[PDB]
Amino acid sequence: MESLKTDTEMPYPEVIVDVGRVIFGEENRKKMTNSCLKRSENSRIIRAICALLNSGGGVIKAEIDDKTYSYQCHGLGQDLETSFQKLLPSGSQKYLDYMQQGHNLLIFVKSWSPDVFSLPLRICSLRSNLYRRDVTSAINLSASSALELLREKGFRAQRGQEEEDMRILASEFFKKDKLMYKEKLNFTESTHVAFKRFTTKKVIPRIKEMLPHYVSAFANTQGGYVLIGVDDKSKEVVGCKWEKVNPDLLKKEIENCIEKLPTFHFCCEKPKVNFTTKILNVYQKDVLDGYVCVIQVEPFCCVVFAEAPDSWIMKDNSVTRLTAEQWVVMMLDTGYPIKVHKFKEALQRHLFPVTQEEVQFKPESLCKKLFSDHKELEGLMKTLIHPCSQGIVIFSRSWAGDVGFRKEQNVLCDALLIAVNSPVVLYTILIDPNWPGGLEYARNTAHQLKQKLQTVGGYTGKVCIIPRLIHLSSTQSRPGEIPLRYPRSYRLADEEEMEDLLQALVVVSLSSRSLLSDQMGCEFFNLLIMEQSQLLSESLQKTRELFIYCFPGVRKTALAIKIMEKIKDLFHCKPKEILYVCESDSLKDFVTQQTTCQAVTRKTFMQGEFLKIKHIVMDETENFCSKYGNWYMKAKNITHPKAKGTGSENLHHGILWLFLDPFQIHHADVNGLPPPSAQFPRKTITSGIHCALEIAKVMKEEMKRIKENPPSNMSPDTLALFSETAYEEATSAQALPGVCETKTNLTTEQIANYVARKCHSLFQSGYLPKDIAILCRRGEDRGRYRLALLKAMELIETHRPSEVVFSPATGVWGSHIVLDSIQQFSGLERTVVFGLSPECDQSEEFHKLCFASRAIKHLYLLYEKRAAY
Amino acid sequence: MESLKTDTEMPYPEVIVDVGRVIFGEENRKKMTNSCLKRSENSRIIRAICALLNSGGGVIKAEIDDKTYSYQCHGLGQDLETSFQKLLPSGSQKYLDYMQQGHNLLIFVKSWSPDVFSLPLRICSLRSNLYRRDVTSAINLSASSALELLREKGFRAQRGQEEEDMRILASEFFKKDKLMYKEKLNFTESTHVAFKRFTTKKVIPRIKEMLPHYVSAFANTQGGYVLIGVDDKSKEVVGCKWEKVNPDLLKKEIENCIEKLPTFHFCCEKPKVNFTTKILNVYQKDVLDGYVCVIQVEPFCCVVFAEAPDSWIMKDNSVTRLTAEQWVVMMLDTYPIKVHKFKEALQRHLFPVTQEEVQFKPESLCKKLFSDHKELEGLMKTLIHPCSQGIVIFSRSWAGDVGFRKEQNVLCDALLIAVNSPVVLYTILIDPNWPGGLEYARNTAHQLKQKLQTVGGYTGKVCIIPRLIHLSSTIPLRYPRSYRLADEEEMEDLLQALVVVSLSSRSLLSDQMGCEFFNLLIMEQSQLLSESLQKTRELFIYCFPGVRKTALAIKIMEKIKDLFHCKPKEILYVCESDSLKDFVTQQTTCQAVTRKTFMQGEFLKIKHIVMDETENFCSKYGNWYMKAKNITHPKAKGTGSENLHHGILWLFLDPFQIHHADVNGLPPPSAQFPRKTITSGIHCALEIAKVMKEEMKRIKENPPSNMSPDTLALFSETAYEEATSAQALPGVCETKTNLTTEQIANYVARKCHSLFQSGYLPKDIAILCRRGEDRGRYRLALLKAMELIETHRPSEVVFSPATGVWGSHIVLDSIQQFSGLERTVVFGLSPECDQSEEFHKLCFASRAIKHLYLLYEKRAAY
Ligand SMILES: [Zn+2]
Ligand SMILES: [Zn+2]
């Protein structure tokens, strides 16, 4: 199966299992003469249901034999119901919904999501086929008891009396060499002896049919003796006729049966199941009559199966039985960030609120682009949605691409309608209605989206995504008829169900690469920064001077802003009494807009005099230069004032927090800081990493390269505090899927064309120009790159709606693309970063870190060709 | 039941139920003519099993009808086995063991401990009696499914289609006002309609019997209609004869039945179950023939029971059914964890399983008992034989050690734990003619097993066999072989359970394992605190009362030596008292001096300084802080030092226990940064911590002159409660008031004698007096009291100054001389104190680990 299988009559998104012709109805089921057909049909239906439960859900199609059968009047069938109850002890309503359309009965099977309150039963099984022996009975363990036994045996392996009277009597019987006719047994059945239903006219068939059960029961429990040749009622040694079957054939059949038994091993030794078969002779008046067989099974280290556990899955459009190995692996279960599942409720409440207002079109950016490019989309969608007042329509250029699958050019956009008391509907808009593959695209996209919701999102409920195909060129909406019918239980019923589906959509979007993924990632990062700021603020009451060491990608500035707010709250000071000192002007304007507290650059700080400043927070401390003056003593004097006699009854100490990034030092001169031995007390922050996995991986590779061959300016002691293990833990905890690409050996025109094409593609998907940052290492190439980019974007944008405007790094907050040097972009970040740098050898490759620290989710490093002289 | 009930014939420790005469055996069970007796006997046995499972375990005693019945030859019974396997789906062998002695068949029922791999099914139940309607069938939910439904409804309440076609047709049938004879229904049964087995000759008994099931099924699920008067096979409105029963009587019976139904509510509104009963008339050719009753049940917010859930417990020597409220509370469930974290290490250190000869524990009590009674060693060696591997744990009173009464006539109790042996509890009696020995042994064994299962968390079959012995002298209790310990792992698990039980009680063994537990906890805190060595160089550590600063300081010194690779003599400890100096000098290899020695001397090779008792430092000699800074923070001298180093200056501060009114010499509280507040260092009894918290509140409410508001601000009672709950252990704190000197001496002598008889060594007693000039008077009075009490007088009573804390003698010194040192038992002898001077309870309590006896002398008369 590449995508799905074609079914014109019932083009459902889900997988369809055809169980052939079945007889349905209580009266018809009872009056069936053929019991074999009854059992076969029941088995087919139950196997299909189990496979659909373990394979994500689906539809079962059955051709109804009687042409006068109505589900409302007749019913389903009693035996099928007993089977359903056996398979689903919790309840069959939560998973199975029935429907009669035409002459076909459709059973809708929900995916087996283990109930949070219930035991974590990963998969559903009819019978474990793991037998454990209670007193005088061998019980086919249920799924829950099977999990009990598996977990107990696993713990035992990983770690490293009248019952005994029955065992002793059975052992004494075993040791005996010969027996007498009508000799009376002095013991009955127990946990360690079983002899009932074992004597027949033909012993071989009964042994083959029944021995596996008792052998599994004895091996799983402790000990056991199986006796063949003892009459059930009278407990005498009747024996088996010698002429009927010789002892050697019976012994070989027994060893064959025990060898065919499936087994699963928790331990390393992996012993086979061991058993001793001893054949006893019975003599009436010293003439041979027959023989009695005793089988002894010792306790077995792990679980032994009577046969393959009859649990089914779906594999290659077919219902497939699960082997013991597969069953135990799937049952014992022997990684998207947890923070997503912690914050999905707040994210849904912020971005996708369930309100009684009119229908909302999201996301705003893509909606604006689509509606400006196509004027009829607003009207067409408003007409199609009607009648619906409450709901959200989530637009995407390609939902299939949004869930990780192929993107189709012929699909203009996809709309996902979520509403209360309505099914989820996926609208696919086509540029040309004559495109043959629209229906397949819609069906596959709906199937993939539902599967992603259930698997990644964690949705545990009945949801139907109905593929509806629409065209802009059509003057009249809803052409033809839509025959897709689902039970009323599959539409969302309350606002809580809508909230749950939207939270699952939040998780799915945050686990993928898309425009919506990027926007919700920004909101997620805001929440994470709030949590980190709250955690770090606890040091305000315990320290006054602190040296904060930050890994690459920590986002020091947001933490600094929120820490400044926390200082204002805690110390009850006026906002203008807190000073933020940075090195770059651009960061100064950024912070000036983001915070009400005072923000100055180092030159202003040294030139000016700050009498009213009570607390100082310094960022970009690595790049500070001491040529103008020694700023550290100034900050110390403003923060730590020496006592002047008795004038100050209670001298105060302020906050002198310095944020340092040892890795990104671009000033070879001395910083003016105290030596690394005097940089105490210190804190290392690793949990601020807010970027893509790809960008974090690039930054870690550069970190390792720097640590292996440290440069002159950096020192071993500062490099020692940063470990790769902590960086992996933080990245796995806090990073989101993204894009990082590298291109080499390109001319200026090729770089310009690549940037123009990528920007056009991103804009078509709903990215705004404020998310694009084009950064060049060498500042003298700004004009050349600007001319090349103007030419490229003019060529690409043939329609040319508005002029292309690039803004300097000062205008980060504005709505324009940023084209400036890396030095001018220090401390500032944007979602998409284009790094235009000349050809770099191994020595100069360290600037990948500088480029990556500026990118949040996209990073396109482009390298120019070597100049020819 | 005060302790237990007397059973001379079967004196088992456990609770015994008598299920009367029962017929046993497959042949006998099958051939029974009377089915009512069969059902009654099966019900009695299963109810007793359920009660024993939910009530800690016990024994079932059944008298066998047949005198020729042998369990091995015959068996137990098929119906009984099926009932057992119904009650225990996991397995009946783990909980039920059978045994035949005499004419009685005994069933040994283990306590229902929910398996760690299991769903948390707290109690066992035959039937939930909670019904959930699958389509066409109403199912009595199992215990697990009942728990699932209860949790779902609780979460829902706390938070705040052809099936639909069936419902619509049923609603249309409901709305109809008239019916025709042999009118064919156009619908069959679904999740929302049920009418099978409802039409009988006498409708009322069948309704009374079956209606609760369907009402519960409909209420628990969504909606439902019940139809009365429809023939099963042909689906036509046969109707109920009008003469047989009037509609009003049937309606009132339905209302009575529905009202009688038990219910449990997860919500505050508490609505009753709502339902509409409508009576429909059937006419054949317009003449009345009968009537049809339709009952509508709407979805109901909470769970509705068909009847009281048949789960039983034990209450007042009786098998008692559980009501719905009790069952739901017990099923939904609506001591420090560090004990369960450290019990394995504690048992490996203190009760190791080895192939060596049997070990007698604890050593102190064993020495006392064997010295006082010479024959006890030989008697125990004889009784234990044949046994090589095992531990014998001695107690003056195991009953007292598990919280129950102490008996004077019991010399001691020995608990024998061994592999391939039952646990045996030996009670030694001074006078063998004491009537109550057997009852004492039985009750003690019962209480010890119950404590093990409940507090200790033991999940396994254990038998504690009461055995009574007498020193002056020159058993029918039979348990299944599964009740004896089988492996070394089972012995280890039982020993871990015993460790938890004793750490959850008050005894000598409790105190010794408390000391080991506190050592492990201090190791964990020291490891956690040592992380600040890499992040800070000068630190001001603020400690709540009872933090045990000195042990943390010693382990921090060790961590400094490990981290900075410095010689032990390069790390310096500065304290104020000579006694703590000597203590630390013995406990550590690093240099330890007092403040006077620190200021007089010169320390060239010292690279790191750790200071304790910093609140009591006096600046009259000079500025010790500046000296510490100069030693730890050296100013650069030109280019001589290529890489200047900064040392560690860690100051341990206790703001509450400031006894020097003069300025400490510390920097002002605004310059005391960076700072750390240690809360998780509290290692004492709950009672001592409570006294310290009360004194803390009293001090915070009325702060004295020397302390400052900023210093008191960091100490909150929420943190103190969290710490005390996390890391404190049960203990004793007592206060006596208005006693004269000889009464105080007699009290101390009597308490010391009682503690010594229980195995306490003299090194665990510290007698501390607030006023130092009373030391001689108290010493004379205590010597007189102790010589009067110890009539035997084996050895002289020796009191040691506070310098000799490490020695094996009672300490009699002032509180000032005992600063920074602790002992298990502390006696506080102080004069009468008013509200202003009550603050010294904190000083007295900081010196006690598990026992504190504050004694106040009478006011002096002039
Ligand atoms: Zn194995
Ligand atoms: Zn309620």
Author numbering:
A (entry chain A): 1 to 160, 178 to 351, 378 to 912
B (entry chain B): 1 to 160, 178 to 351, 379 to 518, 525 to 912
Task: Pull text from the paper.
SLFN14 is another important member of the SLFN family (group III proteins containing RNase, SWAVDL, and helicase domains) that shares domain organization with SLFN11 and SLFN13. The SLFN14 RNase domain is followed by a linker domain (366‐571 aa) and a superfamily I helicase domain (572‐912 aa).
To reveal the structural details underpinning the function of SLFN14, we determined the cryo‐EM structures of the full‐length human SLFN14 apoenzyme. Because wild‐type (WT) SLFN14 protein was not suitable for single‐particle analysis, primarily because it strongly aggregated on the cryo‐EM grid, we introduced four mutations, i.e., E211A, C365S, C775S, and C808S into SLFN14 (denoted SLFN14mut) to circumvent this problem. The cryo‐EM structure of apo SLFN14mut features a dimer with an overall fold similar to that of the SLFN11 dimer. This ring‐like architecture of SLFN14 is composed of two copies of SWAGDV motif and helicase domain forming the body of the ring and two copies of N‐terminal RNase domains organized head‐to‐tail, forming a central RNA binding groove on top of the ring. SLFN14 harbors a zinc‐finger module located at the C‐lobe of the RNase domain, where a zinc ion is coordinated by residues C318, C319, H282, and C284. Using software PISA (Proteins, Interfaces, Structures and Assemblies), we calculated the dimer interfacial area for SLFN14 as 2807Å2 (ΔG = −17.9 kcal mol−1), which is larger than that of SLFN11 dimer interfacial area, 1848Å2 (ΔG = −1.1 kcal mol−1). By contrast, in the SLFN14 apoenzyme structure, K213, R214, and F215 on Loop 211–220 are shifted away from the active site, suggesting the SLFN14 apoenzyme structure may represent the RNase inactive state of the enzyme.
